[PDB]
Amino acid sequence: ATFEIVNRCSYTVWAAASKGDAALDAGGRQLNSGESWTINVEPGTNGGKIWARTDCYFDDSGSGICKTGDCGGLLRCKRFGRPPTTLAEFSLNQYGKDYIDISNIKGFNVPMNFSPTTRGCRGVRCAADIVGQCPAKLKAPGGGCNDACTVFQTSEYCCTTGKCGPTEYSRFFKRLCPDAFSYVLDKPTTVTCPGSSNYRVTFCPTA
């Protein structure tokens, strides 16, 4: 499947793509304002994620650091990134269907639209100014808006026991972005697409 990753932000981002234990495609790449990067993701990819990283510095070998979404200091991510990270999430060719969503469960750093480029389903979007409106205790000094689990490490926020309800913090993410997961047991906003759909992830889709 193809994922066109587009940076409409006025600032450079470093796109990242991983399924947790491996890179997807090259795993990461710099995207200046306006640039597009098309990757190929193997059919059947389960638990894939795409995100943006901000304020990165990498050396010649592709080692360095990002202020949000850093994946073990690598330009080419093999692992998931350090919160806060707005997450485009997907599992492909699962009994004939693709499943996509956006998640704020690991916080928010960059606004995002996640849409099919092929027919048969709708896209999802979280493009509200979550960083600007972020509750004081959730603000990440490094940039972005942390989820409450990341900040407070409680069973309730992290849904450790598999029992948890919505919280004041999760309700903030849900208020600004109704179409993204705000906590682990949120009412699913997952979209069912035809198996083997193709997609576009757009950072800052409205700016």
Side-chain angles (χ1 to χ4, degrees):
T2 60
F3 287 71
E4 186 179 38
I5 308 178
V6 178
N7 184 22
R8 193 167 293 151
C9 307
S10 56
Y11 48 88
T12 300
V13 304
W14 286 258
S18 177
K19 67 181 183 59
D21 61 346
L24 300 176
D25 197 281
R29 211 206 84 177
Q30 179 170 332
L31 276 66
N32 294 336
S33 181
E35 294 197 323
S36 306
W37 178 38
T38 305
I39 61 167
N40 290 274
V41 175
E42 198 187 24
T45 293
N46 193 48
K49 302 189 193 303
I50 287 163
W51 67 104
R53 299 167 287 174
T54 60
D55 299 305
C56 305
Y57 297 88
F58 296 106
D59 62 29
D60 296 313
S61 70
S63 280
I65 189 184
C66 301
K67 286 204 180 178
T68 69
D70 187 52
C71 60
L74 301 189
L75 166 62
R76 301 187 177 192
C77 295
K78 301 179 183 191
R79 306 268 191 273
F80 292 142
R82 192 176 188 274
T85 52
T86 320
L87 295 176
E89 306 182 316
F90 48 93
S91 298
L92 310 181
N93 313 100
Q94 303 300 307
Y95 304 101
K97 293 297 174 180
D98 292 358
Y99 297 88
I100 72 179
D101 69 76
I102 291 171
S103 173
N104 288 136
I105 289 169
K106 290 293 183 176
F108 174 103
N109 60 338
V110 177
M112 165 194 288
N113 179 98
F114 185 16
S115 295
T117 51
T118 51
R119 343 192 210 276
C121 57
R122 68 163 182 107
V124 289
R125 177 181 298 199
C126 175
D129 183 22
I130 277 175
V131 174
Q133 304 294 359
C134 187
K137 301 193 184 187
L138 295 190
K139 290 184 208 250
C145 191
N146 289 316
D147 63 284
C149 171
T150 294
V151 175
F152 293 106
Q153 297 287 95
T154 69
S155 292
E156 190 64 16
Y157 294 139
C158 304
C159 301
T160 311
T161 68
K163 316 98 188 188
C164 59
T167 63
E168 196 167 300
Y169 293 126
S170 78
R171 285 185 190 93
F172 158 79
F173 290 93
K174 196 59 165 187
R175 178 171 64 80
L176 267 75
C177 285
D179 287 340
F181 285 85
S182 62
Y183 72 107
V184 170
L185 292 194
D186 207 348
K187 176 184 183 51
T189 43
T190 304
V191 174
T192 308
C193 291
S196 294
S197 295
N198 295 320
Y199 302 95
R200 178 179 287 117
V201 177
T202 312
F203 301 120
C204 305
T206 57

